[PDB]
Design a protein around this ligand. Structure first.
Ligand SMILES: Cc1nc(C)n(CCC(=O)O)n1
Length: 165
């Protein structure tokens, strides 16, 4: 089960951890992927989760896109968690580096409310270009279900905890 997390609120927990290593250890019902609309898992969390599935996540995702078309920014889909989780909830936070509306971050976090408990990264953080402090604020103010946040970067984890209101 989830261990070593700092409790931020009644339902939001945080840990300085590699989400792939966390997923392999916990085997959560849901691991959230920081997806893009095409489910092209190239880098960041998506690239790391996909590599851990030996590319099975990308093969499954390509079939999903062939059938359904792209997701919306702020949207999600539930696919297999492969060797990492029962399910992977692919959530598209806005990518500020692609000029996407940062206001869609709340809509992206609303997807988490469809799942009782999730292992997740901070949406739109990292290579998506948004401020991770703002992402954590939107997370705690939007998500009502139990969310265990894995923050890879140690220095960022310390900054997130020390500045948390
Ligand atoms: C600076 C940085 N490096 C990464 C990865 N990020 C995204 C948030 C995290 O650490 O999980 N932000």
């Amino acid at each position: 089960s989830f261990s070593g997390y700092l409790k931020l609120t009644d339902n939001v927990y945080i840990k300085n951890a590699d989400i792939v290593e966390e997923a392999k250890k916990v085997k959560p019902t849901v691991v959230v992927n920081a997806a893009n609309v095409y489910l092209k898992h190239g880098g960041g969390v998506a690239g790391a989760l996909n590599k851990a599935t030996n590319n099975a996540m990308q093969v499954e995702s390509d079939d999903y896109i062939a059938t359904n078309g792209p997701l919306k920014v702020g949207g999600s889909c539930v696919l297999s968690g492969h060797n990492l989780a029962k399910h992977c909830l692919h959530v598209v936070g806005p990518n500020v580096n692609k000029g996407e509306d940062i206001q869609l971050l709340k809509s992206a976090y609303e997807n988490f409310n469809q799942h009782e408990v999730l292992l997740a990264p901070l949406l739109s953080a990292g290579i998506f270009g948004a401020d991770p402090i703002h992402s954590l604020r939107v997370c705690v103010d939007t998500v009502r279900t139990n969310v265990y946040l894995a923050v890879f970067d140690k220095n960022l984890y310390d900054k997130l905890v020390s500045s948390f209101l």
